[PDB]
UniProtKB/Swiss-Prot annotation, chains A, B:
Protein name as catalogued: HTH-type transcriptional regulator CatM
Organism: Acinetobacter baylyi (strain ATCC 33305 / BD413 / ADP1)
Residues forming coiled coils: none
Similarity comment: family membership: Belongs to the LysR transcriptional regulatory family.
GO biological process: catabolic process
Top-level taxon in the UniProt lineage: Bacteria
Factors inducing expression: Negatively autoregulated.
Annotated function: Positively regulates the expression of catA, catBCIJFD and benPK in response to cis,cis-muconate. It binds to the catB-catM intercistronic region, to a specific sequence upstream of catA and to the benPK promoter region. Can also repress pca genes.
Shown residues within the full chain: 90 to 303 of 303
Amino acid sequence: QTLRIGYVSSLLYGLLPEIIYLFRQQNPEIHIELIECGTKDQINALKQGKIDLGFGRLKITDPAIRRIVLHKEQLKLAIHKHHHPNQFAATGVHLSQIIDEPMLLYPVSQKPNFATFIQSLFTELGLVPSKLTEIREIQLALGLVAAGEGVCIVPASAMDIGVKNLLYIPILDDDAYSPISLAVRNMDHSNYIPKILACVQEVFATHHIRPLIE
Amino acid sequence: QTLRIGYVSSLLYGLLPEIIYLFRQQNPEIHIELIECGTKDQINALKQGKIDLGFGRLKITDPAIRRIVLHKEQLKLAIHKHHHPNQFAATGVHLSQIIDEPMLLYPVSQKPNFATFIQSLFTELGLVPSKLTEIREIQLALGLVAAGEGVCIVPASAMDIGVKNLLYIPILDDDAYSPISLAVRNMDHSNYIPKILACVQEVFATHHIRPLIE
Ligand SMILES: [Cl-]
Ligand SMILES: [Cl-]
């Protein structure tokens, strides 16, 4: 049997690869195909049987799809380490403090996506970012911050991406988090679902994190 | 005036963003456009005036293009930290030791590219890698190593990419390095060329590295 798992790349800096690695060692018989797939696109891919599991980073719902929320990652503002030493405290900023700053969004894809999500955080607060640029993928955006192209809001795990000379400052607003979720077809009764969820639990426990399931 | 700079993303984990940042602060008047462009594609882009500077990671020559070699990055084998504890010594491996291992190449693009370069290192030694898979971009490949998909040869600066649970082992063969080079049109006499080269020198000196120029 072949298990097709959709994922977004920003999740590769967190616990997901560990989870897949553990699943694989526990289930060596199963052939695993990892497939890069945007969060919205995972819905249709699941429906059409092109993937069996979808790991995504923003909330999208569908009646045919069960969304299993694993964890909420706090958002951070990535800045060049010498950018605004006084007005951007290391203890954190509110989104209201950064509307004047050149801001990098990601990815470049058909919307809705993480770029529209981040924009919505401002919109629901009645804030308007003054300059937005859409960048292909998160790692590029962080590279461009270091090169002097402004600021970029990222999930906590992106703090470890190896771009030099950055600081990652907490975003203080309540709604500023990215949910890590696992999507599956509602009428899929395969044993790989409880098996992968068991692996999620083992890895989270290893790291002293309680997942939002159980 | 607008300065168009081509780059490959793997260079964002090294000194390049610092260099661009310094250039920018020293030359605030100049508008800078950073453009993602493969190393071979930078040749034609320079010729057609679509970029003015091309930062690449493999050796490609053209009579109309001046190639300025800045630095040579040693290659490393990225492995899951528990993969072959005895046969892959942390002190280093020869390419001959890894031909049986599932190997991830990158990027997926029209050849020649870094994937064909890495393949050529084996070929010139009379070695044949048993299983090669081409992956879209370096960060994905490293994520897939962590998830259990095998091994991946990367430049030294990619050791800092934030994928968890990897080890990066020296490749011992003499030809196993990636040259960082700056490409320009031979008949381009703009002052941004000596200016960016001066910035390269300042940043390298900051890091106690002697560049291969001067
Ligand atoms: Cl992205
Ligand atoms: Cl790449």
